[PDB]
Ligand SMILES: *[C@@H]1O[C@H](CO)[C@@H](O[C@@H]2O[C@H](CO)[C@@H](O[C@@H]3O[C@H](CO)[C@@H](O)[C@H](O[C@H]4O[C@H](CO)[C@@H](O)[C@H](O)[C@@H]4O)[C@@H]3O)[C@H](O)[C@H]2NC(C)=O)[C@H](O)[C@H]1NC(C)=O
Ligand SMILES: *[C@@H]1O[C@H](CO)[C@@H](O[C@@H]2O[C@H](CO)[C@@H](O[C@@H]3O[C@H](CO)[C@@H](O)[C@H](O)[C@@H]3O)[C@H](O)[C@H]2NC(C)=O)[C@H](O)[C@H]1NC(C)=O
Ligand SMILES: *[C@@H]1O[C@H](CO)[C@@H](O[C@@H]2O[C@H](CO)[C@@H](O[C@@H]3O[C@H](CO)[C@@H](O)[C@H](O)[C@@H]3O)[C@H](O)[C@H]2NC(C)=O)[C@H](O)[C@H]1NC(C)=O
Ligand SMILES: *[C@@H]1O[C@H](CO)[C@@H](O[C@@H]2O[C@H](CO)[C@@H](O[C@@H]3O[C@H](CO)[C@@H](O)[C@H](O)[C@@H]3O)[C@H](O)[C@H]2NC(C)=O)[C@H](O)[C@H]1NC(C)=O
Ligand SMILES: *[C@@H]1O[C@H](CO)[C@@H](O[C@@H]2O[C@H](CO)[C@@H](O)[C@H](O)[C@H]2NC(C)=O)[C@H](O)[C@H]1NC(C)=O
Ligand SMILES: *[C@@H]1O[C@H](CO)[C@@H](O[C@@H]2O[C@H](CO)[C@@H](O)[C@H](O)[C@H]2NC(C)=O)[C@H](O)[C@H]1NC(C)=O
Ligand SMILES: *[C@@H]1O[C@H](CO)[C@@H](O[C@@H]2O[C@H](CO)[C@@H](O)[C@H](O)[C@H]2NC(C)=O)[C@H](O)[C@H]1NC(C)=O
Ligand SMILES: *[C@@H]1O[C@H](CO)[C@@H](O[C@@H]2O[C@H](CO)[C@@H](O)[C@H](O)[C@H]2NC(C)=O)[C@H](O)[C@H]1NC(C)=O
Ligand SMILES: *[C@@H]1O[C@H](CO)[C@@H](O[C@@H]2O[C@H](CO)[C@@H](O)[C@H](O)[C@H]2NC(C)=O)[C@H](O)[C@H]1NC(C)=O
Ligand SMILES: *[C@@H]1O[C@H](CO)[C@@H](O[C@@H]2O[C@H](CO)[C@@H](O)[C@H](O)[C@H]2NC(C)=O)[C@H](O)[C@H]1NC(C)=O
Ligand SMILES: *[C@@H]1O[C@H](CO)[C@@H](O[C@@H]2O[C@H](CO)[C@@H](O)[C@H](O)[C@H]2NC(C)=O)[C@H](O)[C@H]1NC(C)=O
Ligand SMILES: *[C@@H]1O[C@H](CO)[C@@H](O[C@@H]2O[C@H](CO)[C@@H](O)[C@H](O)[C@H]2NC(C)=O)[C@H](O)[C@H]1NC(C)=O
Ligand SMILES: *[C@@H]1O[C@H](CO)[C@@H](O[C@@H]2O[C@H](CO)[C@@H](O)[C@H](O)[C@H]2NC(C)=O)[C@H](O)[C@H]1NC(C)=O
Ligand SMILES: *[C@@H]1O[C@H](CO)[C@@H](O)[C@H](O)[C@H]1NC(C)=O
Ligand SMILES: *[C@@H]1O[C@H](CO)[C@@H](O)[C@H](O)[C@H]1NC(C)=O
Ligand SMILES: *[C@@H]1O[C@H](CO)[C@@H](O)[C@H](O)[C@H]1NC(C)=O
Ligand SMILES: *[C@@H]1O[C@H](CO)[C@@H](O)[C@H](O)[C@H]1NC(C)=O
Ligand SMILES: *[C@@H]1O[C@H](CO)[C@@H](O)[C@H](O)[C@H]1NC(C)=O
């Protein structure tokens with residue numbers, strides 16, 4: 001189960017191996033120049049793509065983690081399934097298509113309603 | 129309120145939008161070479177500037193946060209103001225000039241007096 | 257005690273200065289091109305080497321720290337010394353040779369036995 | 385009970401090799417491709433640290449040699465050429481007041497502004513630039529049948545500005561401050577630096593000029609002394625001063641050769657003609673080889689007659705000494721520094737020859753034409769070292785004979801980079817402790 005491994009398995013299993021895939025995300029002198037830039041155009045790309053996901057998880061409060069849990073009540077109209085027909089019977093590759101259009105609705109209901117609210121309450125407790 | 133947004137507002141408000149500005153911090157073949165390096169000289173620059181601030185916050189113990197609080201008693205001689213004449217009546221752009229000369233005095237009174245001390249006390253509690 | 261500083265001192269001391277060394281880990285137009293790539297081949301290198309260590313510490317659960325402690329019982333057959341003959345009487349430069357062959361045995365007994373186990377138990381407590 | 389703990393930022397290292405930069409304070413050197421230097425370098429003592437160095441498996445020397453020869457090639461891309469320079473070029477002897485046929489008065493046809501009208505011009509050439517083919521005498525330019533000739537632009541300075549190599553992040557440079565270092569073995573005094581000290585790329589042969597002096601004695605270093613296919617590097621603890629002049633007082637002419645191209649030739653001689661020379665004093669020199677004999681006598685034993693003798697054959701590049709004073713390339717006969725046997729205001733004039741079409745790197749198919757300079761050259765240098773080689777042959781433990789060695793540019797630099805070793809930092813590390821993570 002290397003790169004992408006259990007891509008057929010149910011979502012219920014599939015996630016006991018997340019670190020396995022997290023570690024993978026990162027005299028002819030004129031010809032020696034062009035073919036050097038073609039390597040740097042890719043090496044710099046993976047560093048930007050790694051860092052633009054970790055920031056997103058820093059602003060959601062889940063910095064330095066791989067699984068986390070939020071404080072955002074799931075809506076009924078985000079999918080009409082059960083608790084189990086998603087984990088035990090679907091894959092992530094299929095689930096990504098299911099709620100693809102609902103992504104940025106969730107990502108706003110994270111940060112601006114979850115973490116700004118709790119961060120303001122922390123300074124109240126320190127001031128106490 | 130996009131880039132730099134509330135730059136006129138008081139410091140008291142001004143900081144409910146910090147994540148908004150955190151996400152912004154990151155046959156003619158010879159001509160095709162020079163104008164390729166001019167892009168990489170900038171893309172690599174923003175990655176270094178992002179990472180040289182997150183390290184500074186890792187060593188201050190405030191890793192993975194945006195607002196934090198320390199354990200360093202503020203000195204009277206660092207400014208002669210009140211609690212409120214700084215937050216409710218000044219801006220950050222003006223406050224940056226106020227204590228500009230006092231920056232690295234604070235940054236040493238962070239790390240070497242705050243976090244080294246607490247980190248040594250943690251291993252005492254584990255050894256208990 | 258700058259770069260590498262107390263490299264002669266015992267391991268027992270030697271580590272009160274870890275942040276000191278953590279901050280160090282990061283018309284002739286054709287000639288102006290070759291000698292530009294030789295700078296980017298090094299600047300991109302230090303960013304990859306920094307990020308490939310922080311990830312390793314994210315997956316071990318010690319994200320955003322410099323000293324941490326795990327939950328992995330040290331084996332007797334990993335060295336036959338005392339508690340004190342390692343800290344008070346050896347250096348890190350010598351200790352690195354001592355258990356060099358035993359590195360990846362430890363790094364597997366981290367992550368797959370330490371942090372996967374605790375992370376699954378957290379969702380049990382949330383479900384309670 | 386013990387548990388694993390993790391430390392990040394631990395001062396351990398490994399050996400590694402990498403591409404170093406350049407740093408310094410319209411020359412072909414430093415001003416083009418370097419960065420501004422560190423105003424305040426540091427030198428961190430590391431007490432109790434003992435490393436082992438090896439100056440002959442160091443790779444700082446070979447990658448510098450790569451980067452030096454690249455600078456001389458990537459700079460000369462925009463420097464005209466001299467494809468039309470080859471001509472039958474009838475020539476005579478210069479008739480001036482001459483104390484001596486080592487300078488000739490040639491004449492040849494070249495193209496004028498219009499590319500349809502002949503133009504009969506002339507200039508001076510040294511004896512070494514002129515080849516006889518077969519009445520009067522028809523000569524050919526040298527290195528026409530092998531290579532193509534490129535004139536080094538007469539606006540570019542060549543002066544050796546010192547170089548400072550600096551390591552990038554995640555690396556470090558060590559330095560062995562102690563003495564009595566025959567390039568290998570341990571080192572009790574190690575420090576840590578950001579940048580190597582001043583290195584001045586000076587392409588000499590058989591005798592090291594403007595080098596770094598030794599500490600107390602003459603330091604003799606070689607890979608193996610019983611191996612004859614190796615060079616021996618001697619290093620002086622006191623300089624020996626040398627003075628090269630020439631009474632030239634030459635002139636500069638120019639010939640337009642195509643639209644927007646210019647060829648700088650030698651004009652005429654305003655004065656008399658005398659050869660060049662180079663003076664060394666017979667007292668600081670004769671009591672320097674005594675010091676070298678004393679350290680050579682220590683390796684080979686006692687009752688070893690030590691002879692010195694000149695170079696036994698080869699190209700002009702390896703049997704003479706070649707300077708560069710002011711922008712001219714000399715070839716001086718030094719077979720009078722080395723003519724001596726050792727058992728138990730007077731100076732030496734070294735004659736010299738000058739050539740204008742040279743081949744600095746002993747390559748194939750490359751040449752460059754050195755433009756002349758106006759005025760008389762007076763250059764003062766001091767000698768800090770010798771490159772020796774030993775003759776093999778018969779087993780008589782009564783006499784050894786040493787000759788000047790040469791044939792390699794990677795020995796001018798190995799004499800200077802024997803102090804450093806590039807390491808690699810590894811920040812992670814584990815160790816056991818009495819500490820437990822509570823969940
Ligand atoms: C190292 O030193 C040795 C001396 O110990 C030196 O060997 C000598 O080299 C010279 C040339 O450099 C030789 O001299 C030749 O001697 C013959 C006699 O056999 C002469 O006829 C030669 O005359 C030539 O030049 C004339 C013009 O000057 C011409 O008109 C004539 O036709 C000849 O071409 C020439 O002088 C000499 O034989 C040797 N050996 C000795 C014992 O002198 C050696 O060259 C030095 N090494 C280097 C690299 O210079
Ligand atoms: C090398 O030989 C060349 C040609 O043989 C010399 O060039 C020629 O030098 C003579 C000097 O007697 C010039 O003659 C005089 O020139 C002036 C001005 O041109 C004129 O007014 C006089 O009546 C007389 O003719 C001659 O012009 C000049 N050029 C040519 C093409 O012949 C050269 O001087 C010799 N080299 C050296 C170093 O002297
Ligand atoms: C060994 O090191 C010395 C020290 O730099 C070198 O001496 C210097 O050589 C240069 C050669 O160009 C001299 O420059 C010339 O100076 C005269 C008069 O000052 C001027 O008319 C010229 O335009 C030119 O600038 C310089 O004076 C001289 N001495 C110093 C700097 O003290 C020597 O050349 C080195 N040896 C070799 C082989 O490079
Ligand atoms: C470099 O210098 C050496 C040392 O002077 C040169 O060797 C000497 O060269 C000259 C002329 O080539 C020799 O002079 C001749 O000697 C014979 C001996 O019988 C004499 O009959 C002639 O009239 C003439 O004077 C000299 O002997 C010779 N050797 C010495 C002094 O030991 C050498 O030629 C120079 N090398 C180069 C490449 O120029
Ligand atoms: C691939 O799909 C197959 C479908 O047959 C999965 O195999 C079994 O599927 C049934 C019903 O979906 C489950 O009740 C079983 O537990 C599954 N496993 C076995 C061993 O019978 C299979 O799990 C899927 N994934 C892979 C990686 O094979
Ligand atoms: C810009 O400055 C103006 C100054 O008038 C601020 O407007 C008011 O300022 C007074 C006194 O400073 C406060 O008591 C009010 O609360 C401010 N707001 C309003 C709506 O009257 C203003 O807040 C500043 N910032 C911006 C973004 O306009
Ligand atoms: C370098 O090694 C020396 C060894 O002498 C260390 O100096 C003392 O060593 C003894 C026994 O190892 C200790 O009991 C002392 O406490 C050490 N210190 C002093 C001041 O006497 C020394 O600590 C080592 N490190 C450095 C940086 O010098
Ligand atoms: C320089 O150019 C002139 C002019 O072309 C050459 O003069 C010719 O020389 C040849 C040689 O035999 C004669 O056959 C022609 O009749 C000459 N022409 C003229 C117009 O004089 C001359 O040879 C060239 N070279 C030199 C060295 O002077
Ligand atoms: C280029 O021309 C020179 C002209 O001197 C050639 O040098 C001579 O070549 C012949 C033939 O091999 C030799 O016998 C001579 O000894 C050489 N030297 C002299 C001074 O005449 C040279 O060989 C030519 N280059 C090539 C590649 O043939
Ligand atoms: C080298 O030759 C030039 C001539 O090309 C000499 O220049 C002369 O210098 C003197 C002063 O020393 C002036 O009075 C003359 O007017 C200059 N002549 C010209 C034509 O400009 C120069 O002095 C010579 N250098 C020496 C003798 O070493
Ligand atoms: C180089 O060394 C020679 C060796 O003595 C010096 O020699 C003579 O010096 C006088 C005084 O100027 C002259 O008249 C002679 O013509 C010189 N002879 C020779 C062979 O050079 C000479 O002066 C020294 N010169 C330099 C510049 O060092
Ligand atoms: C090499 O050149 C130096 C510099 O000129 C000479 O040293 C000077 O020699 C003269 C002799 O006329 C003395 O008066 C000076 O005191 C010397 N020193 C200085 C600093 O000028 C040296 O003599 C030359 N060596 C030779 C000719 O072999
Ligand atoms: C090299 O060594 C030889 C051997 O001693 C020298 O030859 C003698 O030199 C002296 C003075 O130079 C003459 O009086 C003798 O006549 C020479 N010997 C013979 C047999 O003629 C030679 O001079 C030395 N050369 C140098 C440059 O030191
Ligand atoms: C659930 O989603 C619908 C539309 O997607 C929205 O109108 C509704 O307010 C959401 N429910 C809650 C409780 O926010
Ligand atoms: C406050 O600052 C002054 C000078 O800036 C310093 O001398 C003084 O010790 C500081 N006060 C405290 C309590 O550290
Ligand atoms: C200690 O190491 C040995 C071999 O290195 C291994 O066989 C043994 O199981 C280890 N002990 C424990 C308790 O895991
Ligand atoms: C001219 O020089 C050649 C070789 O340089 C020589 O053979 C000839 O004798 C010289 N002639 C005169 C007149 O100087
Ligand atoms: C050269 O050195 C030796 C040994 O010092 C000495 O005997 C000899 O006379 C010296 N010769 C000259 C010319 O100084």
Ligand SMILES: *[C@@H]1O[C@H](CO)[C@@H](O)[C@H](O)[C@H]1NC(C)=O
Pocket residue numbers: 685686
């Ligand atoms: C060689 O000679 C020196 C002269 O100082 C002497 O000290 C040394 O002991 C000798 N060595 C041998 C092996 O004879």
Ligand SMILES: *[C@@H]1O[C@H](CO)[C@@H](O)[C@H](O)[C@H]1NC(C)=O
Pocket residue numbers: 623764765766
């Ligand atoms: C060596 O030469 C340089 C430059 O010619 C001179 O400045 C220096 O004083 C000389 N002597 C030394 C370094 O002993």
